[PDB]
Write a protein that binds this ligand. Sequence first.
Ligand code: FNA
Length: 119
Amino acid sequence: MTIEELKTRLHTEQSVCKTETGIDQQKANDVIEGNIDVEDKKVQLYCECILKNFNILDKNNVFKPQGIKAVMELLIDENSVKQLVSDCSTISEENPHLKASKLVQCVSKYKTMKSVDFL
Ligand SMILES: c1ccc(Nc2cccc3ccccc23)cc1
């Protein structure tokens, strides 16, 4: 993968996850910009859908380091990715939906999805 292919792939996942979840564009924009309303159900589901589609979350919402590295190593330096994995893999949340939004919130501290528009 390259950054340009990530951009294309992410746009597609955002599109399909929007129709799967019914999230309003305004709330999708908030998520993409890194402002996560972690308790909003459609935000949770949108986050979950994108992360599952990238194999960052497995079917039972377990965080997968391989999946997050495949994406983040395109965007930030190796050592920063290591720290991101160690940080965001240890989020204190057991509920799958809330875990999904909290994971996007944690990671957004490092890079937001909107990042890919600044290629
Ligand atoms: C875990 C991994 C990534 C993200 N956010 C995002 C940051 C920037 C590019 C991305 C590409 C694919 C999926 C999420 C991306 C949130 C939680």
